[PDB]
Design a binder for this molecule. Structure first.
Ligand SMILES: O=C(O)c1c[nH]c2ccccc12
Ligand SMILES: O=C(O)c1c[nH]c2ccccc12
Lengths: 141, 141
């Protein structure tokens, strides 16, 4: 028994790094940076979301997200717009061009996830996803 | 249903970022950088491990780890040594000074982990830790 062997933050960080690194290699081989992939995948099939929400789901600092959106909007892959009510809030959406650019990569991402989860079986896979979702929802600001 | 809502790499990354960020604030309030905390906590109670293993468990790139160890060894918190056999391998250990420096923070880390896991109950907490450990062991290089 070493402290790190069963310390939750260390376990989450290692599992996340290893799984994400595998798929990020595929994304780069398909011409996407990790940050572009995270943004487009987070916006695909979504209503417009705030910059702060996008930063949270992409685990990226908000100033970095803003600069990324500057370049992604220049390339027509995303669009920023004002919020219906509070204009201290900028919303962002994926465009059709961005969705078409990322659709095949998303199918590859689903295949990779299926391979990662297959050894665990449907019950354990769903339990993992449910626990992770509940943890996120309890700890998000 | 949006793709990102139940995409495993996104769930792992968000849960990890949120949980780790909470404890990293405590570490900094106790005078530790995140990288110093990760290294000392990973070495506490451990036999000497390779630099590559340390980089994996601390989710830090190996060149960055080497520079970090240069400064941590200068401060007497860790020690590098040669491997018994293959001297292409450098091992690293925590020193008594480093252990005494980090012991209280480790107790705080255990308390924080207990609070994070308490709402899930012992069964779900252990299932999460077991799944994460099995995933790491399947995906580590
Ligand atoms: O806090 C984190 O994110 C950690 C990731 N790897 C680790 C190893 C030891 C302690 C904390 C962490
Ligand atoms: O691949 C990752 O690490 C991701 C973290 N947040 C995301 C959101 C959408 C897609 C991938 C990720």
């Amino acid at each position: 028994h070493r402290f790190v062997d069963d310390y939750l933050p260390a376990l989450l960080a290692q599992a996340s790094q290893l799984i994400s690194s595998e798929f990020h290699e595929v994304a780069r081989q398909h011409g996407f940076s990790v940050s572009e992939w995270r943004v487009m995948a987070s916006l695909a099939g979504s209503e417009p979301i705030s910059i702060g929400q996008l930063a949270q789901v992409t685990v990226t600092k908000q100033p970095t997200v803003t600069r990324l959106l500057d370049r992604m909007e220049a390339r027509g892959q995303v669009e920023r717009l004002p919020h219906e009510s509070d204009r201290r809030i900028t919303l962002v959406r994926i465009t059709r061009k961005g969705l078409k650019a990322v659709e095949h990569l998303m199918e590859l991402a689903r295949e990779h996830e299926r391979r990662v989860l297959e050894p665990f079986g449907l019950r354990r896979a769903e339990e993992l996803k449910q626990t992770l979702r509940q943890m996120i929802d309890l700890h998000v600001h």
